[PDB]
Amino acid sequence: PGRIDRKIEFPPPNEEARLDILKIHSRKMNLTRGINLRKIAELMPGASGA
Amino acid sequence: PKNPDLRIAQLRFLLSLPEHRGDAAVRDELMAAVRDNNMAPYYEALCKSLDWQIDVDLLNKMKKANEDELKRLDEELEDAEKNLGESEIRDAMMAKAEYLCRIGDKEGALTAFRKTYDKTVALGHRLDIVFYLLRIGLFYMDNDLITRNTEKAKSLIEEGGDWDRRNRLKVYQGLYCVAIRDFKQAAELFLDTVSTFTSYELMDYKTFVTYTVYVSMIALERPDLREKVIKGAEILEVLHSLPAVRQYLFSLYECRYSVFFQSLAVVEQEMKKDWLFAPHYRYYVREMRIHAYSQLLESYRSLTLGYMAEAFGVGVEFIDQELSRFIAAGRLHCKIDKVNEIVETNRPDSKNWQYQETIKKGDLLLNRVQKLSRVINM
Amino acid sequence: MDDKALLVEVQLLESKTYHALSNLPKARAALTSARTTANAIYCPPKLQATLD
Amino acid sequence: MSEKKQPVDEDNWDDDNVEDDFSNQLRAELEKHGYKMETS
């Protein structure tokens, strides 16, 4: 810790956090109606996020 | 409600101006008007249709009871419960506003609309109010209502929410059909036909197919008409149902002109039963006849009109008088002839068309810099 | 449901009638869904040639 | 800028282009335009 002061992890995102990543890349994507991103976010048991 | 509501505006028109068309329209409108508690907007129709009948007082106490049932509902609501916006005060007070379009006239409905638009922050509920102004402005064809709220829809609302605007893509050019824009804008944005659920926002589907196919053959003849309406697939499903419309199409494309007029006379007679009708019927047929003449006089430079006596219909003198009106009209670029009886054509060339355009664009800019040079220098 | 061999019949029979109503790309998508459905059956011993 | 020569000065929304060309020639377009065929 004389050299590197901050060690910062990056865990795989939560179900609340997989929703927000999904909203950013589906922003310019054009969805119709009757569609639930939270159901799709629950279809990823521990996705990477990328 | 308001979802099948535009059939009424058809039966208002269809009963009114043809008085000979007055047998079955009055039979299923007055019973439909005593249904749904329709009380305000038919007094004008009751002046033009049959005289009077006293169920007015019976439905007035019915229209007052449903008014008073919702009156005591939302005054107790606004005086006890104090959460606002898109809350219970909102949907009760729009139920007053939905009541005054379904039953009442526009005036109580529009002042409830402009009151409830100033209260809300969710633009989807704002756009639904603008959906309601656009529909009641389409009933009474108010040209000043529609110029406002379409600008509300484009500018003031639709920078956000998405794919409920395709409902208005059917409306912006449905208003272009009731105007004289039967030429290019209506055919351009009726071209996306994939919205099939016969809703309030999608008022009918099969008649929408007939509307988008009538307007389509004036925008373009052969700068690839055939890809969008002939090679198009989902348009070809529903015109495979309707036998006369597909016959009306393929007579024009496959160049069978005798059966084309038999289809065209049926279309003009079927055109008469429309409610956005006033710019159609004189202007549509006269444009489609000179439309078919331009491609027929194309590929030829020496046509005898005796060849048009049987490969076209009949009536040697009838072709003669109709070409004579069209050549004198500044259109239909050919020259009709007597006793040789040979319709001779003429067209510009590369040099002749490019000089006729530059002689006009040059003089317009020359007259433009006449004024500009004299605005300056005193 | 859970039964599978009846799906391959109704996916293929719709791909007939969308082609019969001259809708080419929707009959394409119904046939492609019939292909990926037909990859998990004991035997289509005659329905294979009907599909092919 | 008064020039001392002034003193006097789809309803019909694009009507005059239609009207200068065709006026009143049996606009139902069937009784003679579609009914030539009794002659032949």
Residue with tokens 């072709």: B319
Q: Residue ranges of the alpha helices (H) in chain A?
A: 15-25, 37-41
Terminal Cα-to-Cα distance of chain B (whole angstroms): 65
- Contact (Cβ atoms closer than 8 angstroms) between residue B192 and residue B165: no
Apex CA B167: angle with CA A21 and CA B104, to 5°?
125
CA B164/CA B170 separation, integer angstroms: 11
Determine the residue type at A23: K
SS3 string, B134-181, reads HHHHHHCCCHHHHHHHHHHHHHHHCCCCCCCCHHHHCCCCHHHHHCCC
The b-or-e profile of D12-22 (16+ CB within 10 A means b, else e) is: eeeeeebeeee
Say yes or no: B91 contacts chain C, CB-CB below 8 A: no
Structure tokens at B200: 């309030």
B180 has a chain D CB within 8 A of its CB: yes
Distances (CA, A) of B48 to B18, B22, B59, B137, B203: 12, 11, 21, 22, 27
Contact, B42 vs B33, CB < 8 A? yes
Contacts of B236 in chain C (CB under 8 A): 22-23
B75 to chain C, any CB pair closer than 8 A? The answer is: no
Sign for the pseudo-dihedral over CA of A18, A24, A25, A28: positive
Tell which residue, C41, C34, C29, C26, has the closest CA to residue C8. C34
Any CB–CB contact under 8 A between A4 and chain B?
A: no
Please, are residues D22 and B325 in contact by the beta-carbon 8 Å criterion?
A: yes
Of the candidates B292, B306, B378, B315, the one whose C-alpha atom is nearest the C-alpha of residue B343 is B306
* Exposed / middle / buried, residue B367 (Cβ in 10 Å: 0-12, 13-18, 19+): exposed
Structural tokens at position B352: 């002749």
Say how far apart CA B322 and CA A7 lie, in whole Å: 89
Terminal Cα-to-Cα distance of chain C (whole angstroms): 25
List, in order, residues 6 or more apart from B117 with CB less than 8 Å away.
B126, B129, B130
Structure tokens at B65: 């009871």
Helix (H) or strand (E) holding B345: strand B342-345
Sign of CA dihedral B223, B238, B213, B128: negative
**CA-atom Rg of chain B in angstroms:** 27
Going by C-beta distance under 8 Å and a sequence separation of 6 or more, which residues neighbour residue B101?
B2, B109, B132, B135, B136
**Is the Cβ of B354 closer than 8 Å to some Cβ of chain D?**
no
Beta-ladder partners of B342: B304
Let me know: does B279 contact D15? Beta carbons within 8 Å.
no
* A38: its two tokens: 């939270």
In sign, the C-alpha dihedral spanning B111, B117, B120, B123 is positive
From chain D, the residues in CB contact with B320 under 8 A are: none
Q: Technique behind this structure?
A: cryo-EM
Of the partner residues D29, D39, D40, the one whose CB lies closest to the CB of residue B268: D29
Q: Return the ∠ at Cα B53 (arms to B52 and B58), rounded to 5°.
A: 135
Across the interface, which of D10, D27, D30 has its CB nearest the CB of B180? D10
Query: CA–CA separation, B295 vs B91, rounded Å?
Result: 58
Q: Which residues in B have their CB inside 8 Å of a CB on A?
A: 162-164
Q: Which residues, listed in sequence order, are joined to residue B234 by a DSSP beta bridge?
A: none
Dist. CA B99–CA B361, nearest whole Å = 56
Inter-chain CB pairs, B–C, below 8 Å: 14
Beta carbons of D33 and B265 less than 8 Å apart:
yes
Contact C21 B240 (CB under 8 A): yes
Query: Using an 8 Å Cβ cutoff, are B277 and B13 in contact?
Result: yes
B343 strand-pairing partners: B303
- The residue ranges of DSSP E strands in chain D, in sequence order, are none
List helix spans (H) across B18-55: 30-34, 43-48
B31's tokens: 């019973």
Other CB atoms within a 10 A radius of the CB of residue B290 amount to 16
Residue B260: enclosing H or E segment and its boundaries?
Answer: helix B257-271
Residue type, position A5, single letter? D
**Separation CA B58–CA B61 (nearest Å):** 6
Chain centroid to CA A33: how far?
Answer: 22
Resolution of this deposited model, Å: 3.2
Kind of pairing between the strands at B302-304 and B334-335: unpaired
CB spacing of B234 vs C26 below 8 angstroms: yes
Question: Which residues of C1-52 form beta strands (DSSP E)?
Answer: none
Write out residues 217-236 of B within 8 Å (CB-CB) of C. Answer: 233-234, 236
Q: φ, ψ for residue B335 (rounded to 5)?
A: -135, 115
The reply to whether D22 touches chain B by the CB within 8 Å rule is: yes
Query: What's phi and psi for A4, nearest 5 deg?
Result: -110, 120
Best mutation site among B127, B162, B201 for testing chain A: the one with the most A CBs within 10 Å? B162
- Label residue B42 exposed, middle or buried (CB < 10 Å: 0-12, 13-18, 19+): middle
Using a CB–CB cutoff of 8 Å, tell me whether A28 touches chain B: no
How many residues make up chain D in this entry?
40
Distance set, CA A16 to CA A11, A24, A29 (Å): 14, 13, 20
Q: Is the dihedral of CA B363, B365, B368, B369 positive or negative?
A: negative
CA-to-CA distance for B62 and B65, rounded, in angstroms? 5
Structure tokens at B346: 């003429």
Q: Are D29 and B268 in contact (CB under 8 A)?
A: yes
The conformational region for residue B33 under phi > 0 = left, psi -120 to 50 = alpha, else beta, is: alpha
Judged on CB neighbours under 10 Å (0-12, 13-18, 19+), D8 is exposed
Identify the three-state secondary structure at position B342: strand
Hey, what are B75's tokens? 């005054």
- When computed from its CA atoms, the radius of gyration of chain A, rounded to whole angstroms, is 16
Order of strands, edge to edge, in the sheet holding B302-304? B302-304, B342-345, B334-335
Which amino acid appears at position B14 of this protein?
A: L
Angle (CA) B105-B107-B110 rounded to 5° is: 110
Cα torsion through B14, B20, B25, B31, rounded to 10 = 130
Residue C8 phi/psi, 5-degree rounding, is -70, -30
Residues B324, A24: Cα–Cα separation, whole Å: 65
Residue B327: both structure tokens together = 């050549």
Closest-CA distance, A2 to chain B, in angstroms, reads: 50
Beta bridge partners of B344: B302, B335
- Show Cβ contacts of residue B272 under 8 Å, excluding neighbours closer than 6 positions: B18, B281
Tell me the C-alpha distance between B94 and B117, whole Å: 10
Token pair for residue B121?
A: 């922050």
Q: Please give, one letter per residue, the 3-state secondary structure of B192-223.
A: CCCCCCCCCCCCCCHHHHHHHHHCHHHHCCCC
Distance CA B205, CA B199 (A): 9
